[PDB]
Amino acid sequence: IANQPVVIDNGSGVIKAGFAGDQIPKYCFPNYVGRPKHVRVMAGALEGDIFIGPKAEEHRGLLSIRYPMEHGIVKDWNDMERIWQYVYSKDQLQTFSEEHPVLLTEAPLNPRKNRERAAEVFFETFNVPALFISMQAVLSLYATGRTTGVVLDSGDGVTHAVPIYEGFAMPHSIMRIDIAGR
């Protein structure tokens, strides 16, 4: 039988995460792949060789940050796993891949191969019971409650004019320009 899903709001630049029914994504931090830049010497010098969050802010110019999300389109799938592991950790999820259903966000018309790659992760390495990944604009429409709506929204290195109306799939009218604030 299923469990409580986890509302994980990703994005080209910032990831948001909380469980189902919550009002606040309890685990928010941007989308980044950090790992050290120096020669570790003394004892107590934090191992893991990949650090996120307080360690990231704590070691800003000490950790080489990476952004494989080429306008959201990521390439360090292994590091994506580890990002989720950071979430999976006692820090954010404190659970397993099977202990909870997953919810995830998807930008429009991305290469399907990426999605499938993530599915390989989510159901082979990670073992998601049930999930679904789709348009963030749709979720924003749920928040507004509107059904008829041209959603203008931009990620961090992605811009996307999304003319929607009552869930009607209008990909010809719907656009996206993968360039933004990044």
Partner 1 sequence: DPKYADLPGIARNEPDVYETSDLPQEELTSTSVEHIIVNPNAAYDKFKDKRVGTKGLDFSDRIGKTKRTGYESGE
Contact predicate 12/155, CB 8 Å: yes
Regarding 21 and contact with partner 1 (CB under 8 A), the answer is no
- The DSSP letter of residue 21 is T
Name residue 125's amino acid.
T
The stretch among 35-43, 143-151, 156-164, 166-174 that binds partner 1 (CB under 8 A) is: 35-43
Regarding 45 and contact with partner 1 (CB under 8 A), the answer is yes
- C-alpha 80/C-alpha 73 separation (Å) is 11
x-or-dash string of contact with partner 1, 52-81, rule CB under 8 A: ------------x-----------------
- C-alpha 165/C-alpha 146 separation (Å) is 9
| Residue 37 touches which of partner 1, ligand ADP, none (Cβ within 5-8 Å per kind) | partner 1
> In the numeric block, which tokens belong to residue 46?
């934090």
- C-alpha 156/C-alpha 11 separation (Å) is 8
Could you tell me the CA-to-CA distances from 55 to 35, 52, 78 in Å, in that order?
10, 6, 20
Contacting partner 1 (CB under 8 A), which of 1, 2, 41, 143? Answer: 41
Decide whether 100 or 160 has the Cβ nearer to ligand ADP: 160
The stretch among 6-14, 41-49, 54-62, 111-119 that binds ligand ADP (CB under 6 A) is: 6-14
**Which residues in this chain contact partner 1 in the complex, by CB under 8 A?**
36-41, 43-45, 47, 49, 64
**Which residues in this chain contact ligand ADP in the complex, by CB under 6 A?**
11-14, 153-156, 181
